[PDB]
Design a protein around this ligand. Structure first.
Ligand SMILES: *[C@@H](C(=O)OCC)[C@H](O)C(=O)N[C@@H](CC(C)C)C(=O)NCCC(C)C
Length: 255
C-alpha cells in the first residue's frame, strides 16, 4: 500500500507552505515552528488549496503561555497543537514581512553556517502576547484565528507515521540533537559522533530511500542556508535519535 517514497511538496503542489523554510531566530521556539508549519500545510490540504496561509509562529509562541512551556526558553509540541484547538492561531509571515496578522518579531540569524545575517545567539526573551493585528490588516485578530478540530500523538511506529503523513499531511516531531548534526549538509543523517545538545522539534513531510538507507524528509527552522536548503534527511525505521517517538498532529476545523 504505502509507496517507497513520498514527498508532501509533490503531492500538494498548490500548497506553497509545504515548501517553505522558516527561521526561528535566536529564540528556543522550535516547538512552535514545527507546529505552525505543519498546521499551515494541513489547512491548505484540508481545503484543497482554497485556504493557504502562513500560520503565525508569533501567536503560538507568545499567547499559549505556561501550558506550552516557556516561550523562547523551550516548549511542548503536544500542547502547541492543543492550543490551536482551544484558542486557534492567527496568520503571520516572516520577520519584517508585514504579511498576515502577527508576523514573527524575532530577526533571522545564521545557525551554525556562514552568511550575511548576524550569528544566532542564546535564547532571547519571549515577546508579549499582543492580541492585535499589524496596522492595515483587514480581518481582526479574533476573526483571523484558525482552529484545530483535534490534536493527537502518532504512535512510535514507522508505518503509522508514514500513513499519517500520506493521508493527513505533514506532522511535527522531535529528536535529540548531537553535535555532529549541526554540520549536516546532505545525505541521510545518522548520529556517529558528538555529545548531546538537547531536543529539537521539526516538521516531517515525507520519506524515501537514498543509497539503500531509509530516511525521513524533514524541514528544519534554521533558514535555508543551513543543511540542504533548510531541509535534512534522517535515518528512518529505528527511532533514530527519537525521531519516531514524539510525533504529533491534528486536523483543522473548517473556517
Ligand atoms: C527547540 C529549539 O529551539 O532548539 C533549536 C536551538 C527548543 O529548545 C525546544 O522547545 N526544545 C524542547 C522543549 C524544552 C527542552 C522543554 C523539545 O521540544 N524537545 C524534544 C524532545 C526530544 C529529546 C525527543
Amino acid at each position: 500500500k504505502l509507496p517507497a517514497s513520498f514527498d508532501a511538496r509533490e503531492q500538494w503542489p498548490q500548497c506553497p507552505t509545504i515548501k517553505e523554510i522558516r527561521d526561528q531566530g535566536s529564540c528556543g521556539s522550535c516547538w512552535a515552528f514545527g507546529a505552525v508549519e505543519a498546521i499551515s500545510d494541513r489547512i491548505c490540504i484540508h481545503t484543497n488549496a482554497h485556504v493557504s496561509v502562513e500560520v503565525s509562529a508569533e501567536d503560538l509562541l507568545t499567547c499559549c503561555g505556561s501550558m506550552c512551556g516557556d516561550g523562547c526558553n523551550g516548549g511542548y509540541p503536544a500542547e502547541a497543537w492543543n492550543f490551536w484547538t482551544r484558542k486557534g492561531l492567527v496568520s503571520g509571515g516572516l520577520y519584517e514581512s508585514h504579511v498576515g496578522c502577527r508576523p514573527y518579531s524575532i530577526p533571522p540569524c545564521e545557525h551554525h553556517v556562514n552568511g550575511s545575517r548576524p550569528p544566532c545567539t542564546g535564547e532571547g526573551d519571549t515577546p508579549k502576547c499582543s492580541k492585535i493585528c499589524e496596522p492595515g490588516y483587514s480581518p481582526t485578530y479574533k476573526q483571523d484565528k484558525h482552529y484545530g478540530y483535534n490534536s493527537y500523538s502518532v504512535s512510535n511506529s514507522e508505518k503509522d507515521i508514514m500513513a499519517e503523513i500520506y493521508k493527513n499531511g505533514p506532522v511535527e516531531g522531535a529528536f535529540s540533537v548531537y553535535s555532529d548534526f549541526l554540520l549536516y549538509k546532505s545525505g541521510v543523517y545518522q548520529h556517529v559522533t558528538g555529545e548531546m545538545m538537547g531536543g529539537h522539534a521539526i516538521r516531517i513531510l515525507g520519506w524515501g530511500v537514498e543509497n539503500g538507507t531509509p530516511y525521513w524528509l524533514v524541514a528544519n527552522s534554521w533558514n535555508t542556508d543551513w543543511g540542504d536548503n533548510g531541509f535534512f534527511k534522517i535515518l528512518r525505521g529505528q527511532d533514530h535519535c527519537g525521531i519516531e517517538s514524539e510525533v504529533v498532529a491534528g486536523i483543522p476545523r473548517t473556517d
